[PDB]
Amino acid sequence: QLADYLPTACADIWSLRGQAVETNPLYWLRTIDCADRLMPVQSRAEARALTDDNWQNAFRRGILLADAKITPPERRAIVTRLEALSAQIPAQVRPVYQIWHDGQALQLALSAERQRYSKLQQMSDSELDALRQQQQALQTQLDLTTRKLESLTDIERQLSTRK
Amino acid sequence: QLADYLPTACADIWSLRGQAVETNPLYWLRTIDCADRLMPVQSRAEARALTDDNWQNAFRRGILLADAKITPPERRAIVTRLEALSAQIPAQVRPVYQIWHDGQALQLALSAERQRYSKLQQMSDSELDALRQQQQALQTQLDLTTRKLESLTDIERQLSTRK
Amino acid sequence: LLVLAWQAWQSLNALSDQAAVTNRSTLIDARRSEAMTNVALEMERSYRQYCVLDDPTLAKVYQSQRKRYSDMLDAHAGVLPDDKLYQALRQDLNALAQLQCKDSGPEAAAAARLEAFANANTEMVQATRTVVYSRGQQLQQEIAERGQFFGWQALV
Amino acid sequence: LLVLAWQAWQSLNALSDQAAVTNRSTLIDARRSEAMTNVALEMERSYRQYCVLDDPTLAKVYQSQRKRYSDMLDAHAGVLPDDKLYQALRQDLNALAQLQCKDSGPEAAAAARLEAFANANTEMVQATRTVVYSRGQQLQQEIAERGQFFGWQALV
């Protein structure tokens, strides 16, 4: 017998606390579906008044700042921190916690993959530039040697035809 | 007020069929839990015999075959199939559908990024091979020319010493 | 008597003609031999350079030089007393017509043949210069002996 | 009479000495001039090759050739009547002592003086040939004068 809070606004549900309500996931789904539609700067403003000493507040801070376009150092920091959250958690919220953990995991995996792709691209460009400049130097050397050969043959022909 | 079924028993979530639990999301949180916590081969075996045209049946099929290293093409095909059938999603069940679609689509994006990185690497290797062979050809041309120059100078020295 | 004086005058005039023609022929022979050796050296240089570079223009230059040397050789047969070595030079020059070689260098038989050709051309110039001394000393000795014979045998 | 024997002895001595020395000097002069032109051409070739292909060994070979040419030029001054031309050749040769050129080819004034050097050497060989012919013709004219003296004595 668990009540439903989805039809009502997400502001008061996000604001309320308590162990009596914390035994239900439905309001967790309400919060996650409200957070993405929220303004990320407003999400940061509302999450700044939160703390990290308890698992619930850190969890909702993770929801609030996850959808926002953030650099992945602090994303890695929070996904390494939420082990403390996992240390204390009832069974009801374990599934949604697991799904959020997978979501963050593939998020940071994609970020690491794209950074690896950029690194490989820049390394390939650098090695291509180096090989191209080496090729240019060796081509100039060949031009010099073939010019020397042509000039030498020309002087031989000129002295031959002088007679 | 929705009935609570906190214990996870995946053996009968197909038998319940969701005719009366369509308003209680914890049913599909149980489904995703029993899907990701079980060995995917039995999930695929049971999903083979499930219905495809029904929206709930197709949804549960997607969850149960979402794993076991399935190829990205049919993955994007099936998520687009649920998007075509996304008109029957209940309002209470909407958030879990949204988060599942976000996860799946981001998985497809990660796979596409991996493919793009592999393709860029293979063009880079091909271009490196081409430039290396071109450099080898120009280097052998240069050493041939310098051999000709050295031979010319040597015959000049020999004829000078002949006198 | 006056017949002796007339004979002496005619012999002296003929001797003058002989001296002039001998001088001219000897000078032209020396010049021809020197040009011969120089053309042989240029032949060697052109052969080696064409073999190294593989240029048909060098081949044409070598052909022109070979024709010039052939003319020069043809214009020198009648001076050298012997014919075997001159004919050897003619055969060597004719056989050195094609330019066959590998890996930037004449083939070993061609290389040895070219060497021997250079040595034989040196022998040509030496032998013709020996003939030059021979002709000069012949003129000298014959004029001296004729003068002494006429002076001593006409003391009366 | 004793006059005939005395004049015969003088004729023998003078004619023999003149014939021998004229032949030898003419041959030496012709050979020296020909070798002069040949080593001048080799000089020019070595200069151009060193300028195109920078190498100290080519420079050393050029130094050796220049020293040989200077020696051979020092032994030809006493034949040509006009010392000015020989001195000009010496000055040009000493001007060609240094090898200097910025581009592939030689310096422009170096090229001009090289062409002047070649033309002057050609004129030198021509003048030496003319002087040799003059000496031969002088021997011919002197012996013709001796023959004319014999003919005048034939009157008795």
Author numbering:
A (entry chain A), B (entry chain B): 58 to 220
C (entry chain C), D (entry chain D): 26 to 181
Please share text taken word for word from the publication where this structure appeared.
Here, we report that the outer membrane lipoprotein QseG functions as an accessory protein that directly binds to and activates the histidine kinase QseE via its C-terminal domain. QseEF, a TCS responsive to multiple ligands including phosphate, sulfate, adrenaline, and AI-3, is essential for the virulence of pathogenic Enterobacteriaceae. Notably, genomic analyses reveal that a third gene qseG is co-transcribed with qseE and qseF, encoding an outer membrane lipoprotein anchored to the inner leaflet via N-terminal lipid modification. Collectively, our findings establish QseG as an endogenous activator of the QseEF signaling pathway via a conserved regulatory mechanism.
To elucidate the molecular basis of QseE activation by QseG, we sought to determine the 3D structure of the QseG-QseE complex. Purified QseG37-221-QseE complex was successfully obtained and subjected to cryo-EM analysis, yielding a 3.9 Å resolution map. Due to the inherent flexibility of HK structural domains in the cytoplasm, the transmembrane and cytoplasmic domains of QseE—including HAMP domain (a domain found in histidine kinase, adenylate cyclase, methyl-accepting protein, and phosphatase), DHp domain (dimerization and histidine phosphotransfer), and CA domain (catalytic and ATP-binding)—were not resolved. The final model was limited to the periplasmic region, including QseG58-220 and QseE34-173. Notably, two-dimensional and three-dimensional classifications revealed at least two distinct conformations of the QseG-QseE complex: one in which QseG aligns upright with the QseE dimerization interface and another in which QseG adopts a tilted conformation while interacting with QseE. The complex structure reveals a C2-symmetric QseG-QseE heteromeric tetramer comprising one QseG homodimer unit and one QseE homodimer unit. The C-terminal region of QseG forms a scissor-like structure that straddles the saddle-shaped dimeric sensor domains of QseE, consistent with our pull-down assay findings. Detailed structural analysis revealed that the interaction between QseG and QseE is mediated by both hydrophobic and polar interactions. Specifically, Leu209 of QseG forms hydrophobic contacts with Val77 and Leu78 of QseE. Additionally, Glu213 and Arg214 of QseG establish hydrogen bonds/salt bridges with Arg70, Gln74, Asp80, and Thr82 of QseE. Furthermore, Arg219 of QseG forms hydrogen bonds/salt bridges with Glu69 and Glu140 of QseE, whereas Lys220 of QseG interacts with Glu67 via hydrogen bonds/salt bridges.
